[PDB]
């Protein structure tokens, strides 16, 4: 509820964060160079041994450590607004679920992040008869996934085409709980990633000769369903139509690699301007976000370090 | 198929469809080697030059008939920043092959 | 006692794995005296 | 109260285990337990027994599809014994038949409404096709589009092939069809073009989007003359269908279940090595029932009824709640609660001797109380028609069981009611205006009346004593049923609390009515500082820091009481302005509209007593649970409950 206390403590991590010149010396390592700055790092912490598998497992255990408990330590509109901001995870470990139900491996198979419920929760839905029973067994009250799967729910008993329309509107219901607060950049900041994710799909389909229709989503406002069709199709010319939105370097591309670099540019660039707001939520979203910018160095520079890769090879991961 | 190199390797190809193994070792490389001989999958075997160079010895041994599944000396990533030196390896092949190396 | 009733069934399956013993070890007994009847009766 | 919930085991074979188990869950009258730790196997039953439940539980899943392919709902019934793979073949061709029929009603809908969509469009657009059917020379752009904006795309047709490009949209005004044609490859370019002016392509699916046109054209029809027939007729032989196999399909559903819940059953057992044991509770007053059930083991292997534990450490204890025949209809209020700590006061007799006092003394509306009696004929009709009441938007499914409870709590509430409506002297409200039944000195005009209540100059304060009276007599009881369950449990922390509570209590109420209340506190200083001592002698003895903030909230839910009387006079009020503006509006107001007015009137109060009475009756129970529950306890590790052996049926 408070929207004030829990920012208190997100100044405080805030004030945890590593700075640019951290990831531009670590241009040069050698994996022990960068495993000593790490061992600086309070990422490091949970520091375990030697190896990219302990370093990507302690910078879990401190993304969970950190990031973890802005899911916890609220209640009220405050937590049904801060819920939906670590939901990516959620939505992929409910999908990763649904699809080892449909494929038939063991309920240990995937990994199973950390997300926003409780993983006992995720080990005791591997055994439901019914998918509508398997979603009330994943009912919180205030999780739009339970309502997202219910809904989508009266279709079949256990579908993909099911998991793909239940993700579009997951992704809707999202944008709906996200018109439906109190706050003037959420909605702006939410409405920009469904946008980009229209983007993304229409990237990711471009050349399939799918029906764009059912592949578009609504929620947007950066674009069009015509323009949508028109990316849909080859022309590079509507991507070059953004023009005065937070699309604006994204121009002259068609490769998706770049493309969704860029976007993810434009989405980190939007999330800086959540340091405007103090007293609402958006800054614990800023928070959020830098941790995931910062998650992405992380694994980036790791891997850059085992696999020994040139300055060049990563020179298109850190121009933002 | 199936691919040996490491898990961080062999995860792309599960990705792709494709049985990956991973061992730090080269005596567990062709552990890992006799463990898809023994179960004997669909034939193909890659095998990192990392890890076994030639690893024609597992099947040599245990299936020296009918050539079945087909070995690779694949690259390793990390090795990948250099190439193989691809000429080196045919010069090798055929020196092993027909005995008389030349140049081409 | 329910579990004093469980070791009146220990009791039991003593005497049912002594059944069970008796006739697989018997069994073998037999065999020993089948090998020296027909052992004697060819020499 | 709570039975004595004996425990009780027994053991012999497997397969007398088996067999014992089918009877005891044909005998489901005792709930199981776990009792794995010492001297005995896992149990665990056998690979053939775990295919043959999969097998019966895949069964018992298709019927349960079947069903619902079907539409109908799983009821319980009498079962149907039959072989396994008897019943599976029972099940597969019904079930065939229904899965063939469900996917072709579907198809046909999706069929018939995709021939809907675009039929005389594709008819329009085939007499337009009269020239290029399949031309080898130029394409056909279709586009079934919006209203004439037909220059935006002209401006298209002008960059494509001048003076040509055939392209005009004649009919079947939902969408203008522009057809346009020129070529193949440069009407190819032109239709790129055109899209990015926007346009679409009439793009069916199946065949219709995939075959000529005049061919597509033919299908469609086809199928549109022959989709309604069709679809009848599915609907018909679905229908036949289930109507004639959902009992079987039914009596196979409750078979499986039973059986699929013999087989989860046989997953609790605690072997003994080639012989088996179980355990588990069950109450005593089926103890007789029980031992005809142990009869039927082989030569009735001993099953041993060992007594339950005490006060102390009985949390696997099944509950139940065994009330009276007068008590019975009482506990469905007590069931939205939890369950005890097994010896825990049983409270729901207070229940039905309070609840329906306080109520009657809430509403005292006798034509309220005869429109409630009449509802109650409605229901108890309902309940004689011996269907489950069924409401849509309510979502209420109700079998007669807690109907016919409702029902005769509503007899018992309404007994008190109309005593105390008679009591407070008010007929559909103030009947004594127009048909003067009550008594007053200022207008008798018949009977007089025992507590008037229009006027609160000299019932108010008695009202407010009686609430008062009956609140500190329900805190003392729950305050001694606290006390007594700490001595009952030998725990003195919650008698000692019981015992300080209600000396502060009682101390708070004499030093109130001493100070606050008249003259005369000779008789009760003593009394106060009794009672304060009482509390601090408790506070020593106990040194839990329950401080003063304890006993205030004790003390506020005592002074709580007088809601009722509040709310009483509220609606008695309410009641008493509607009928007197109705009866003043009718015969005052001309004695000609009294009609009209009347009904008004009773139209008005018809819809205060829906807006009023359910939060009026809801204040006693929520005042019932709120404190005698709270005052003692109720709210404590909320017990096991007895779950037998279900056997369905």
Redesign the interface.
């Known amino acids: 509820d408070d929207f004030a206390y829990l920012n208190a403590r997100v100044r405080v991590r805030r004030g945890t964060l590593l700075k640019e010149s951290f990831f531009q010396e670590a241009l040069d390592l050698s994996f022990a160079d960068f495993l000593r700055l790490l061992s600086e790092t309070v990422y490091g912490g949970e520091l375990a041994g030697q190896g990219l598998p302990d370093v990507d497992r302690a910078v879990l255990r401190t993304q969970a450590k950190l990031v973890g408990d802005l899911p916890r330590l609220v209640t009220g509109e405050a937590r049904e607004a801060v819920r939906l901001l670590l939901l990516r995870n959620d939505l992929h470990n409910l999908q990763a679920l649904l699809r080892a139900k449909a494929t038939g491996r063991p309920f240990e198979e995937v990994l199973l992040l950390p997300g926003t419920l409780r993983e006992e929760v995720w080990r005791q839905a591997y055994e439901a008869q019914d998918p509508a029973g398997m979603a009330q067994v994943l009912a919180v009250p205030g999780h739009p996934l339970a309502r997202a799967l219910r809904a989508v729910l009266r279709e079949t008993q256990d579908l993909a085409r099911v998991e793909a329309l239940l993700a579009k509107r997951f992704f809707e219901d999202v944008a709906k709980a996200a018109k439906g607060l109190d706050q003037p950049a959420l909605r702006d900041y939410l409405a920009l990633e469904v946008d980009a994710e229209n983007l993304r799909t229409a990237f990711k389909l471009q050349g399939s000769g799918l029906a764009p229709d059912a592949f578009f989503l609504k929620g947007g406002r950066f674009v069009d369903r015509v323009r949508f069709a028109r990316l849909m199709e080859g022309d590079y010319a509507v991507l070059d139509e953004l023009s005065g939105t937070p699309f604006s370097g994204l121009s002259g591309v068609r490769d998706l690699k770049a493309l969704e670099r860029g976007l993810r540019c434009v989405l980190l660039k939007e999330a800086k301007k959540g340091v405007q707001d103090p007293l609402g939520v958006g800054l614990v979203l800023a928070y959020v976000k830098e941790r995931e910018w910062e998650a992405v160095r992380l694994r980036l520079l790791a891997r850059r370090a085992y696999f020994g890769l040139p300055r060049a090879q990563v020179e298109e991961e850190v121009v933002c | 198929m199936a691919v040996i190199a490491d898990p961080e390797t062999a995860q792309g190809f599960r990705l792709a469809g494709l049985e990956g193994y991973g061992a730090s070792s080269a005596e567990e490389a062709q552990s890992l080697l006799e463990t898809l001989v023994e179960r004997g999958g669909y034939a193909l075997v890659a095998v990192d030059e990392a890890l076994l160079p030639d690893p024609e010895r597992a099947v040599e041994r245990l299936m020296r008939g009918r050539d079945l599944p087909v070995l690779l000396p694949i690259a390793g990533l990390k090795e990948a920043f250099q190439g193989h030196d691809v000429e080196g390896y045919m010069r090798e092949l055929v020196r092993k092959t027909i005995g008389f190396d030349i140049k081409l | 006692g329910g579990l004093g009733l469980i070791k009146s069934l220990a009791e039991k399956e003593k005497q049912l794995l002594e059944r069970l013993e008796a006739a697989k070890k018997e069994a073998e007994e037999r065999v020993k005296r089948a090998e020296a009847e027909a052992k004697a009766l060819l020499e | 109260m709570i039975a004595p919930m004996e425990?009780l085991?027994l053991?012999g074979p497997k397969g007398r285990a088996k067999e014992l188990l089918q009877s005891l869950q044909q005998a489901g009258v005792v709930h199981l337990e776990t009792?794995r730790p010492?001297?005995?196997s896992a149990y665990q039953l056998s690979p053939e027994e775990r295919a043959e439940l999969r097998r019966w539980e895949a069964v018992s899943?298709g019927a349960e599809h079947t069903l619902s392919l079907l539409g109908l709902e799983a009821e319980p019934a009498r079962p149907f014994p039959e072989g396994l793979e008897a019943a599976e073949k029972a099940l597969s061709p019904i079930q065939a038949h229904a899965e063939g029929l469900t996917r072709q009603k579907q198809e046909l809908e999706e069929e018939l409404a995709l021939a809907q969509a675009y039929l005389e469009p594709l008819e329009r657009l085939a007499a337009l096709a009269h020239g290029l059917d399949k031309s080898p020379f130029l394409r056909v752009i279709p586009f079934l589009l919006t209203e004439k904006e037909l220059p935006l795309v002209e401006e298209a047709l002008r960059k494509a092939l001048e003076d040509r490009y055939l392209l005009a949209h004649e009919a079947y005004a939902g969408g203008v069809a522009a057809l346009v044609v020129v070529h193949r490859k440069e009407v190819d370019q032109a239709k790129?073009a055109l899209?990015?002016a926007?346009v679409a392509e009439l793009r069916l699916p199946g065949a219709l989007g995939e075959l000529p046109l005049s061919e597509a054209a033919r299908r469609l029809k086809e199928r549109a003359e022959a989709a309604p027939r069709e679809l009848s007729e599915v609907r018909q032989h679905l229908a036949k269908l289930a109507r004639e196999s959902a009992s079987t399909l039914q009596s196979l559903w409750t078979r499986a279940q039973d059986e699929v819940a013999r087989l989860k059953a046989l997953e609790e057992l605690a072997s003994?090595?080639?012989?088996f044991?179980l355990?588990g509770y069950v109450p005593v007053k089926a103890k007789p029932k029980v031992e005809e059930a142990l009869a039927r083991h082989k030569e009735s292997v001993?099953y041993?009824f060992?007594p339950v534990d005490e006060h102390h450490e009985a949390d696997r204890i099944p509950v139940v709640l065994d009330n009276p025949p007068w008590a019975k209809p009482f506990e469905l209020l007590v069931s939205f609660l939890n369950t005890p700590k097994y010896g825990t006061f049983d409270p729901t007799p207070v229940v039905p001797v309070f609840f329906p006092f306080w109520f009657g003394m809430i509403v005292g509306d006798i034509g309220y109380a005869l429109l409630f009696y009449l509802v109650g004929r409605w229901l108890s009709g309902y309940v004689k028609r011996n269907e489950p009441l069924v409401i849509d938007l309510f979502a209420l499914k109700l079998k007669p069981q807690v109907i016919g409870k409702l029902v005769h709590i509503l007899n018992w509430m309404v007994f008190w009611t109309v005593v105390w409506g008679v009591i407070y002297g008010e007929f559909f409200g103030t009947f004594l205006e127009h048909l003067g039944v009550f008594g007053t000195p200022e207008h008798p005009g018949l009977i007089p009346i025992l507590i008037h209540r229009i006027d609160t100059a000299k019932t108010a304060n008695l009202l407010i004593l009686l609430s008062v009276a009956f609140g500190v007599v329900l805190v003392f009881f729950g305050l001694a049923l606290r006390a007594y369950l700490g001595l009952k449990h030998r725990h003195m922390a919650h008698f000692w609390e019981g015992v300080g509570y209600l000396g502060g209590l009682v101390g708070v109420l004499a030093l109130a009515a001493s100070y606050l209340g008249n003259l005369q506190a000779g008789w009760l200083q003593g009394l106060m500082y009794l009672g304060f001592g009482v509390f601090l002698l408790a506070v020593l003895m106990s040194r839990i820091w329950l401080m003063i903030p304890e006993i205030f909230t004790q003390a506020g839910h005592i002074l709580s009481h007088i809601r009722i009387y509040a709310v009483g006079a509220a609606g008695g009020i309410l009641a008493g302005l509607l009928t007197d503006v109705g009866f003043a509006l009718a015969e005052r107001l001309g004695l000609l509209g009294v009609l009209l007015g009347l009904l008004v009137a009773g139209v008005l109060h018809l819809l205060i007593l829906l807006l009023t009475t359910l939060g009026h009756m809801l204040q006693p129970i929520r005042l019932l649970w709120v404190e005698f529950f709270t005052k003692f306890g109720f709210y404590e590790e909320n017990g096991r409950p007895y779950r037998p052996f279900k056997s369905v049926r």
Do not use: D, M, T
Not at chain 4, 272 to 275: M, P, T
């Open positions: 425990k085991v053991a009792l010492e001297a005995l899943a790129a899209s990015r926007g003994g090595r080639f012989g044991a355990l001993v041993a060992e």
